[PDB]
């Protein structure tokens, strides 16, 4: 019953991790989605600044990760992924965070080859008139102040819910004494209205908005605006018939309106190729929906349904009169539409409960994806017609998987093995951001092929008395892996997208052990590996081997913890290759980082927790972090350092 700080999350069932994002986390997150994944083994984060990192799963980047919020897809608008999908998520305002590793589900949309990440809120459960309140406050080094409110009220027939947050921090320092360009500020407000006419029926309306800003040590521009607008309608109908367990219907609308520039959170770099003030505004409008039936009978469960999605991207930019020194801000010009995506899919998942110790799960999905290029012109020179203006392209993509789970006779042990095949239609960033496409093509839009992934997942759960253990491995091949290559060319830096063939393997494992009634210990390991077979060399942007060691003492109302994080050097690199955000250049040094936490239950409604992160003020950087920008003093290919010693205190309220 004793409160504690979360430093790692175990895998609680085959391929699946479930955690409550409201619990304090001990390397302390910057109020974004990527940081709350740092505690799940297998995740690493490309750091841009103090917040809004870009999540990598088993070395896989971007849309290979399927990231949903309440069942819906929120997509960013920045062509450089300043505003990756997790940058809009404040996890403390959600109730549950679920990760499913590998291409092992078809229920949640197309293309999820690396895994599926689901932030969800539970519907209120009032049976009579009442209210509940959850809230938290966090105070830390470098002006870190966070504020969270989750209030609801209702009765048997319906409810109203408000969740909200305001979070901010000044620039932090690395372990060498340097101020890193990294301040950020986030806020969210979301309302939910629930109608429960009877216990077999729920209809929920949601709407919310947020905004933010972030300074980016690792970019030429900062994010001065991360506007989000969200609308959602959900309908869940239970026990419809004796076999129809559940019908689910859902629509959602998500809008992102992002501004980056070189003059609101920094000064233009005189020595750079942007000495004049310069702003770029972009937006993304996403409309999608889902309809799913769940059937149960005999020893079988069948989930069947369809989904659909449309999204639209537009941009406009500022102007600088070199003669007048007159600046015309981006909002003075009309939006120019540049891209529209569509997807429609049908999916089905069948489970056979053979006997009591054996489960077979099989899933299939057929997707129809299309995209239209609306760029009339391309942006060295301002000229350039666009060769594929108003062109469309489409494909039809089947995906599926089979998984066997066997429960042992003489132990609390589950073994599993799965084969998955996933096909992903290319990203906005894979089609529109590359300066060049494959050789001989007119552009990336016209030629880049869908990515096709075939992977074996396997592993085991041990749910013992004093020992809790789990392991999960994977071997896989990727046909037409979409890879970025970087060139200088005096123009600046310029990117080419190509398709290559890849081999991947890796795994995660971890154990929890109750030493005594007060002492517990846990460890985890994560490894990922990648080879570019077409070019006979290593895949880029693969995080090195990582281990975590934790030790906790609990005693009635309080606990104390310590944590060692140890990561090996990454000597497997592919220089000047990567994705749309980052590229490899050097082998990384290994490092160790040490942290302490504690927690105290003051009462049943208020608990306190506190941590020191990186106690020894280690100066270090991660393999995947962005190179620092020359305008901030960084040498060439020197990557953004991680924070030095950091103190924080948190008070959680539950009424
Ligand atoms: Cu941007």
Author numbering: 66 to 444, 448 to 723
What does the paper say about this structure?
Here, we show that Pseudomonas aeruginosa OprC is an outer membrane, TonB-dependent transporter that is conserved in many Proteobacteria and which mediates acquisition of both reduced and oxidised ionic copper via an unprecedented CxxxM-HxM metal binding site. As indicated by the successful structure solution, OprC contains a single bound copper and shows the typical fold of a TBDT, with a large 22-stranded β-barrel occluded by an N-terminal approximately 15 kDa plug domain that, like in other TBDTs, completely occludes the lumen of the barrel. The copper binding site comprises residues Cys143 and Met147 in the plug domain and His323 and Met325 in the barrel wall. The CxxxM-HxM configuration, which coordinates the copper in a tetrahedral manner, is highly unusual and has, to our knowledge, not been observed before in copper homeostasis proteins.
Interestingly, the active site His117 in azurin renders the copper atom solvent inaccessible, reminiscent to the likely role of Met147 in OprC. The superficial similarity of the OprC binding site to that of (pseudo)azurin prompted us to generate the M147H and M325H OprC mutants in an attempt to convert OprC into a unique, blue copper transport protein. However, in the presence of added Cu(II), both mutants remain colourless, and comparison of the crystal structures with those of pseudoazurin and plastocyanin show small but most likely important differences in the geometries of the active sites.
